[PDB]
């Protein structure tokens, strides 16, 4: 009985700020342009929605040595300010430094949990240094079910929504008592909100 608007499923779960049944081509989608990795498999997983509670997993407040409130763009707008997806966090350098990040979450919620994060493919050595300082970055996400480790593809792609870089988003199911580990020295789109199942 569940019905969307001019959000897509993606724009929905990531929490586009301009926000069964969706319109085959929605207005609001991915603010920043990119791909939502494993899209359709997720969609198949989501017609079986018996329980769906959004819960926090890593407070935005808890980022002391990176600049949290700055991941905003003239491409994800809200009330004529630059904004971004609510559920994730676009971490930017602070005092011209970007210490590697080592975060980790244990699912102690009796339930499966749907976690969403991403990587920013910036478009040149310029944007890269400006935003994250480190020229050569990685991202490393892991559980007992998943092992991802991704390098950012620095290239200037065709401008879409004002933006010559891209953002890839990934997702995973976290079983009860499994932990997920993040490690990243730049270009990380960090989860803040996840979903119960």
């Amino acid at each position, epitope marked *: 009985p569940l019905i969307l608007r001019d959000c897509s499923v993606a724009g929905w779960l990531l929490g586009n700020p301009m926000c069964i049944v969706e319109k085959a081509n929605p207005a609001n989608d991915l603010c920043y342009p990119g791909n939502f990795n494993d899209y359709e498999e997720l969609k198949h997983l989501l017609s079986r929605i018996n329980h769906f509670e959004k819960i926090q997993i890593i407070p935005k*407040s808890s980022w002391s040595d990176h600049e949290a409130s700055s991941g905003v763009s003239s491409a994800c707008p809200y009330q004529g300010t630059p904004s971004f997806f609510r559920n994730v966090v676009w971490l930017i350098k602070k005092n011209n430094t970007y210490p590697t990040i080592k*975060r980790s979450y*244990n699912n102690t919620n009796q339930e499966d949990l749907l976690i969403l994060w991403g990587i920013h493919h910036s478009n040149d050595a310029a944007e890269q240094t400006k935003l994250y300082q480190n020229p050569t970055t990685y991202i490393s996400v892991g559980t007992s079910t998943l092992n991802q480790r991704l390098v950012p593809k620095i290239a200037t792609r065709s401008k879409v929504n004002g933006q010559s870089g891209r953002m890839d988003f990934f997702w995973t199911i976290l079983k009860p008592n499994d932990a997920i580990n993040f490690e990243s020295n730049g270009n990380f789109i960090a989860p803040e909100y996840a979903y119960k199942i």
Partner: antibody, heavy 126, light 107 residues
């Protein structure tokens, strides 16, 4: 883990002092070793913390200048160091183990001190 | 951040019930622990997340929170329980503690 610290020290103002703390040669993973100071009779004071792995260090806004936390990842031991001690610095010094950046439940932190060292008494009179 | 513990000294018969308080200046939102210290010794964890007991800890040590009012409760005092009780917040660094509450035997 089981933290052991170096023995007790007596020194005079203006002397260098480096106390030590080992006992964590393997952990997994992401963990902080912190330094806590406890003055005779008073409560307790967090001084700073270090990741023995990538030697990342946070100092308290009360101690950034006075002291220096350090690690020789070789022998897997953490050091607290002063350049010029002071009668004020007279205290019990503990090191303590906790997890680096682990979270759980609904956003709460896994950052309580799990394991302590026995203590290192430092005295400056002099 | 400031944790204010209360009281500092508390005289209580063996058998009875003690109620230690700790109050936060800000919000620590349940990221708070209780340790116990005895003379010469390090502190040992009793309570984490304001409510959960550590392993080994009996059920007569209880912990509850009202936002910023944190409450430790010891019932049926055995001699093993007379020492100093600190609260600590690990909501963010610099981690801060209380000033202590010495639990005295009453006769």
């Amino acid at each position: 883990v089981q933290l052991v610290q170096s023995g007790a020290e007596v020194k005079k103002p203006g002397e260098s002092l480096r106390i030590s703390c080992k006992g964590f040669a393997y952990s997994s993973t992401y963990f902080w070793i912190s330094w806590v100071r406890q003055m005779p009779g008073k409560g307790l004071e967090w001084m700073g913390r270090i990741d023995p792995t990538d030697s990342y260090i946070n100092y308290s806004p009360s101690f950034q200048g006075h002291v220096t936390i350090s690690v020789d990842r070789s022998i897997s031991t953490v050091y607290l160091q002063w350049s010029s001690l002071k009668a004020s610095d007279t205290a019990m010094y503990y090191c303590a183990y906790h997890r680096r950046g682990h979270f759980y439940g609904s956003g709460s932190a896994w950052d309580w001190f799990e394991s302590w060292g026995q203590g290192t008494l430092v005295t400056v009179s002099s | 951040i400031v944790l204010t513990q209360s009281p500092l000294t508390l005289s209580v018969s063996p058998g009875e019930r003690a109620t230690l308080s700790c109050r936060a200046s800000q919000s620590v939102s349940s990221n708070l622990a209780w340790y116990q210290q005895m003379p010469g010794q390090a502190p040992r964890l009793l309570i984490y997340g304001a409510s959960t007991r550590a392993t080994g800890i009996p059920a007569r040590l209880s912990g509850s929170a009202s936002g910023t009012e944190f409450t430790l409760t010891i019932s049926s005092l055995q001699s093993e329980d007379f020492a100093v009780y600190y609260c600590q917040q690990y909501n963010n660094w610099p981690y801060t503690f209380g000033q202590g509450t010495k639990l005295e035997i009453k006769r």
